């Protein structure tokens, strides 16, 4: 049936629907820090969130997200790889059931409790829809998340989990601050991709942060407590909503720093 994370409808079936699966630029990847180049000609990242505008938190069966207002130059991303201006759409995460297992990227096979994603389209495009059509129509701010002391600025989103429990609810989240969940440095790895979930098209451009940010035991907890699963269907725990690493074929990963 749909695509999910199960045996049965796992990242190992979904070739099945989305041929595009087996292709040359899938995500996520695994990075070799000791084979990134590191790309003295990369410009440092701008993140412009001072004026970011959260509307809503939707459980969609898959993971839950908080959705921007992208009619406007708000909240975007511009520097670093990026040639134009990308607007914050949308983030979501990827767990584990386990701590020492969440994140899709993994840095010399070292995987994380989670992974964080910002999603942005470049405005070139019009909108979102024309941008997934494009190779250089996203860009994905990927930040890891460890488990250790709180992080502040996620409280917010985890107090509002119990009301978007199952699939299909949705709650009003309004004057969310994503500046929060921003590590200190800006360091980054960057390499040519695709959606971590299906359609799985090859229009991102990922820039994954070096630093992680780290979250509680307790906030990581409750993410866990969230279903897959429809109200009044049968109890089905989102966890492990993470898709393994794919091969890096032609394709080389830049380091913004040495
Ligand atoms: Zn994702």
């Known amino acids: 049936h749909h695509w999910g994370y199960g045996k049965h409808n796992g990242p190992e079936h979904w070739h099945k629907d989305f041929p595009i699966a087996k292709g040359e630029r899938q995500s996520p990847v695994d990075i070799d820090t000791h ?35 992208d009619s406007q130059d708000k909240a975007v991303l511009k520097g670093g ?57 996203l860009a994905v701010l990927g930040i890891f998340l460890k488990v250790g002391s709180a992080k502040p600025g996620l409280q917010k989103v985890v107090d509002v989990l119990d009301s ?23 360091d980054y790895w960057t390499y040519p991709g695709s959606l971590t979930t299906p359609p799985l098209l090859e229009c991102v451009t990922w820039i994954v942060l070096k630093e992680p940010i780290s979250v509680s035991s307790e906030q990581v907890l409750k993410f866990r407590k969230l279903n897959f699963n429809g109200e009044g269907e049968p109890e089905e725990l989102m966890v492990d909503n993470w898709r393994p690493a794919q091969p890096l074929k032609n394709r080389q990963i830049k380091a913004s720093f040495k």
């Open 35 to 69: 084979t990134a180049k590191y790309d003295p000609s990369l410009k440092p990242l701008s993140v412009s969130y001072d004026q970011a505008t959260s509307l809503r938190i939707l459980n969609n069966g898959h993971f839950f997200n908080v959705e921007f207002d």
């Open 81 to 137: 790889p990026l040639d134009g201006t990308y607007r914050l759409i949308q983030f979501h995460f990827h767990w584990g059931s386990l701590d020492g297992q969440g994140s899709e990227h993994t840095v010399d096979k070292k995987k994380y409790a989670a992974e964080l994603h910002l999603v942005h389209w470049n405005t070139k495009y019009g909108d979102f829809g024309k941008a997934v059509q494009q190779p250089d129509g």
């Open 164 to 186: 978007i429990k199952t699939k299909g609810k949705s709650a009003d989240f309004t004057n969310f601050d994503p500046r929060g969940l921003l590590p200190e440095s800006l």
